[PDB]
Amino acid sequence: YTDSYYKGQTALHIAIERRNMTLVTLLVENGADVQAAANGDFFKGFYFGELPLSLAACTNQLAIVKFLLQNSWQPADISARDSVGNTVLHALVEVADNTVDNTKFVTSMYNEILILGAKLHPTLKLEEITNRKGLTPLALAASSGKIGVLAYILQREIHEPECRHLSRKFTEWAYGPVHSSLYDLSCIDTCEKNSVLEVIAYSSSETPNRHDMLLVEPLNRLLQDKWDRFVKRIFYFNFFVYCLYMIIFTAAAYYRPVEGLPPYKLKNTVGDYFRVTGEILSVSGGVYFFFRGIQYFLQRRPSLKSLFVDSYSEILFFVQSLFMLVSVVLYFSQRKEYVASMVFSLAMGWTNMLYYTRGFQQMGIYAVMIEKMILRDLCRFMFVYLVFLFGFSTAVVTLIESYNSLYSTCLELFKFTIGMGDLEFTENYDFKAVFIILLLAYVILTYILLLNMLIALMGETVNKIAQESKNIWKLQRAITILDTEKSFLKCMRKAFRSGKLLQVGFTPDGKDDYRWCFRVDEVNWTTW
Amino acid sequence: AMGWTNMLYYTRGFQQMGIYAVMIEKMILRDLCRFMFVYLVFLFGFSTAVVTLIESYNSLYSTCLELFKFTIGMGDLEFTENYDFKAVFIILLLAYVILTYILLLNMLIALMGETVNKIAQESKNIWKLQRAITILDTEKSFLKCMRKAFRSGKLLQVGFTPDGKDDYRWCFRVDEVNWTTW
Amino acid sequence: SLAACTNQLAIVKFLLQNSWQPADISARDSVGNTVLHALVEVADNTVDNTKFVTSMYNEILILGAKLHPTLKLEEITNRKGLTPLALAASSGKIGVLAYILQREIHEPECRHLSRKFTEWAYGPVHSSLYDLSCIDTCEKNSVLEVI
Amino acid sequence: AMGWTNMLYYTRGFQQMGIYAVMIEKMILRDLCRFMFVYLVFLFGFSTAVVTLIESYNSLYSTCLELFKFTIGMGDLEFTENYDFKAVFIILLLAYVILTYILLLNMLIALMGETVNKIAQE
Numbered sequence A: 001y002t003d004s005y006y007k008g009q010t011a012l013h014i015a016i017e018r019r020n021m022t023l024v025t026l027l028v029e030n031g032a033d034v035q036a037a038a039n040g041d042f043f044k045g046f047y048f049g050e051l052p053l054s055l056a057a058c059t060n061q062l063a064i065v066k067f068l069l070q071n072s073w074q075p076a077d078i079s080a081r082d083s084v085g086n087t088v089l090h091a092l093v094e095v096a097d098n099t100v101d102n103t104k105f106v107t108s109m110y111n112e113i114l115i116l117g118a119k120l121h122p123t124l125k126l127e128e129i130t131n132r133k134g135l136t137p138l139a140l141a142a143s144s145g146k147i148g149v150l151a152y153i154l155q156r157e158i159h160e161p162e163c164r165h166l167s168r169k170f171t172e173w174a175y176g177p178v179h180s181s182l183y184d185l186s187c188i189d190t191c192e193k194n195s196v197l198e199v200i201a202y203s204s205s206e207t208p209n210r211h212d213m214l215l216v217e218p219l220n221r222l223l224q225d226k227w228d229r230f231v232k233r234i235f236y237f238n239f240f241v242y243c244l245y246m247i248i249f250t251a252a253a254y255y256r257p258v259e260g261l262p263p264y265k266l267k268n269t270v271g272d273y274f275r276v277t278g279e280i281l282s283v284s285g286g287v288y289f290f291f292r293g294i295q296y297f298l299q300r301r302p303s304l305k306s307l308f309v310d311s312y313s314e315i316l317f318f319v320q321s322l323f324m325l326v327s328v329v330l331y332f333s334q335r336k337e338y339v340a341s342m343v344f345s346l347a348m349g350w351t352n353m354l355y356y357t358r359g360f361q362q363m364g365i366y367a368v369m370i371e372k373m374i375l376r377d378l379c380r381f382m383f384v385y386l387v388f389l390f391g392f393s394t395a396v397v398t399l400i401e402s403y404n405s406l407y408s409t410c411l412e413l414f415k416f417t418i419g420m421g422d423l424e425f426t427e428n429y430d431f432k433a434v435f436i437i438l439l440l441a442y443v444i445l446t447y448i449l450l451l452n453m454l455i456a457l458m459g460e461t462v463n464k465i466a467q468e469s470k471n472i473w474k475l476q477r478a479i480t481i482l483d484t485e486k487s488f489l490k491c492m493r494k495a496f497r498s499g500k501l502l503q504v505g506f507t508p509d510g511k512d513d514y515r516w517c518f519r520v521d522e523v524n525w526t527t528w
Numbered sequence B: 001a002m003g004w005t006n007m008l009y010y011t012r013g014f015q016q017m018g019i020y021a022v023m024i025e026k027m028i029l030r031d032l033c034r035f036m037f038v039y040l041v042f043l044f045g046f047s048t049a050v051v052t053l054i055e056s057y058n059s060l061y062s063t064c065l066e067l068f069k070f071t072i073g074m075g076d077l078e079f080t081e082n083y084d085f086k087a088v089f090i091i092l093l094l095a096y097v098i099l100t101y102i103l104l105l106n107m108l109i110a111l112m113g114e115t116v117n118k119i120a121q122e123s124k125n126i127w128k129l130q131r132a133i134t135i136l137d138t139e140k141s142f143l144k145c146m147r148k149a150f151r152s153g154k155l156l157q158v159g160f161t162p163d164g165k166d167d168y169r170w171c172f173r174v175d176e177v178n179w180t181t182w
Numbered sequence C: 001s002l003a004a005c006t007n008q009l010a011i012v013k014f015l016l017q018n019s020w021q022p023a024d025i026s027a028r029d030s031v032g033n034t035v036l037h038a039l040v041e042v043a044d045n046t047v048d049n050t051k052f053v054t055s056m057y058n059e060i061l062i063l064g065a066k067l068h069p070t071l072k073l074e075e076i077t078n079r080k081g082l083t084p085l086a087l088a089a090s091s092g093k094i095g096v097l098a099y100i101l102q103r104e105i106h107e108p109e110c111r112h113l114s115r116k117f118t119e120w121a122y123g124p125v126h127s128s129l130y131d132l133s134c135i136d137t138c139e140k141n142s143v144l145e146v147i
Numbered sequence D: 001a002m003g004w005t006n007m008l009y010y011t012r013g014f015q016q017m018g019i020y021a022v023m024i025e026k027m028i029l030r031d032l033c034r035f036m037f038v039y040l041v042f043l044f045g046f047s048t049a050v051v052t053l054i055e056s057y058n059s060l061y062s063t064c065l066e067l068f069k070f071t072i073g074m075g076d077l078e079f080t081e082n083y084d085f086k087a088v089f090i091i092l093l094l095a096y097v098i099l100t101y102i103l104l105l106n107m108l109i110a111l112m113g114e115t116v117n118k119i120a121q122e
């Protein structure tokens, strides 16, 4: 019994796996070691925690955990950490897969484990234990997308004495049908190591339900309050600054001189001075955006795949900055091709003006719809339409013989999609029937069918991504809020939440429980 | 040209593009066919009317082309002056435009929207069927002298047949997780 | 077959193992469709009909194994050379196909008629062995080829 | 002209025409407004780009009109020859056409379909 497929597993593990309770006691009373962690590669098969206690807990055998934790024979270490370091709570967070029954099971098992740990060790905060990756169970749930466990923890309410301090949702004055809940923000806004909001907003883009998690009551209200308190003013100021900068860029570029020698001497004139000032401002903004892109690439450390997956705004801004920098280089390199670069950072730049629509609910949802449509439907349609257009342009140009060039024929065929095809644009075909048949078939296939098909696909898509688009907009707002909070450039400390409140003031040690609670009112009209 | 269109046949292997191709097939089969029937009816009727009324554009082919150019949004609306009855020709062109361009094309759009709204899972199933056909064609004809078409190795299902012999079958292994009571 | 397809399982039970005159479960008519082929044909994918045909096929298979443990009844081919699973595939009997491809019987002396066999299932994770006998390549006509 | 538009105000008395007018109001309020915002963004950006690249069409107004003519399906696609960089101007016009005409207009259509599908009783 030395192979890795069933390595480490002992008689106690087999007894726990068989749902047998008397046999487990018979084994334990003999002297069985409950700390013989199973380090087999089969138990990273399925990975339950690599300990008999975690194995019992994750299989819904609460009785076995109850016996092991407080057995009179050999103590069971609730805080035991395996090779990966994931303790019992981390194992429960990992095993859960958001299923309703599994969600209820993990919620109940986590609650019972926490209660028992407090009972044995009232002075120990079990949930604060960190694995080898430095992620707390709440943080681990946030990273892995365990929405059910996240919702339970953020709404963990326990009324029993000696177990209240483990909760986060604490009731307040509730004389009548209106009650205010204090949601604990401990490590939900800033844990100083890694907060829930940071993990959710700065995820790796592969989390199954990164969008939905922010719908959790406390998190959604916290982010909305942050937006409505101070972030709104700063974001609108940034929007205005961007508009001013881009109008400056448009004025400077539009009034560029037509003369040669791209490096133009600064003639003594007020208008020329204004143009030079505008160019300097535009280049400074481009350098700032380039440095912003570099900073975001270095800090967030994208996985080399999230760049094109969930970070388009930063990518577009960085590419516009690259275009500006290449334009400046060509301007100082005696190359008149700088226009070809400059003009690309102008038009594209105005498109990025859609990035400042994240702050407005309707316009942000519109931008999210634009993103999704371009990603899926516009991409598929462009694939198929390019196939058809290249095929029929090649056919026509082979049949045609000034329009014998492939480029001209492709342009003429594309003009049919914008409803401008001549249908008789040439007379060199020499086979009128064949050319006419080709053009007619192309028109019916692409203009009549493919475009209307794109319309229908987009209608069906918007009919099925409404709430998804709203969730993505809220996620974008969360990302912007966190970026402003971490980087603000105004020397302000208004990122703090509702003042510290005396939750209970009677900790298990008798000390005072002070936590950065957040207050949410609500009204209940039934029986109260 | 037709050849490049068949390049859509190699989209069966990609789920999204295969489903798009299946939607294209279904739309062309049903909605594009019905629309072409009705639109050809209308276009032939109104082209015959105009060409009877017109008299270089007195040919049926030229009038049909000019009327079809309205569907691609290029109809002149005054492409001739030989009609000799401006009111009648104008009424004919207006009626054709409202019947076909405004109504029939938007109708094709609405029909296609309703169709895509009701053949999503059907399109996915047809894509999977096409993938199955391609898989079987490759398996039977491979042109590479390979024997990797076999499935998960023979497994001793029980080993105790009613005759007491060994039951060896080419079983295939599928894992799953049950979180209720187990 | 007439009794089996009309949901009169008691009549089949009596006829198959009557003490008076043996009833040939493998009997083939002019078309050659045996009892299982008849059950596959009669079914029309209806929920109640699907349950009826599933139960009747399971009982017929169990009784045939009981009488003739050494005989694979399902392997009998009609005049067209289509097995009951193959016949269901050809005729589009989705319910019967799903039942056969998931026919799981835990009872001893009747396990070898199944196709879905459980494997190591110590906890909440279990792996099923789906039999691919004549599902990928039967050498005569496989389910995938027919579909 | 505006006056004749107010002739829609006397459609309140007819159930079908009144509901049509209400749909017109809601669509103009929400979907037409959002689409105009985004389309003006795109059109101003690409008109500024083209007019910076172009040099009789060097005026901003003429370039904006020529680009807007693509939305009514009348864009020339070769309306000038002063760009001096055919590749860049062609890329700009193509990108604008795909972004606005193909996508944004069809997007407005889809948004309006979804909106009418949800404001019938309203």
Ligand SMILES: NN1C(=O)C(=O)N=NC1=S
Pocket (backbone or CB within 6 Å): A398, A399, A400, A401, A428, A429, A430, A431
């Ligand atoms: N394009 N072309 C010619 O140039 C010709 O001379 N004869 N046939 C054809 S199709």
Ligand SMILES: NN1C(=O)C(=O)N=NC1=S
Pocket (backbone or CB within 6 Å): B052, B053, B054, B055, B082, B083, B084, B085
């Ligand atoms: N087309 N046509 C003529 O050519 C004419 O001479 N008088 N009336 C008509 S409509």
Ligand SMILES: NN1C(=O)C(=O)N=NC1=S
Pocket (backbone or CB within 6 Å): A258, A336, A339, D052, D053, D054, D055, D082, D083, D084, D085
């Ligand atoms: N517009 N323009 C000019 O007028 C010129 O002379 N050289 N390049 C460009 S882009």
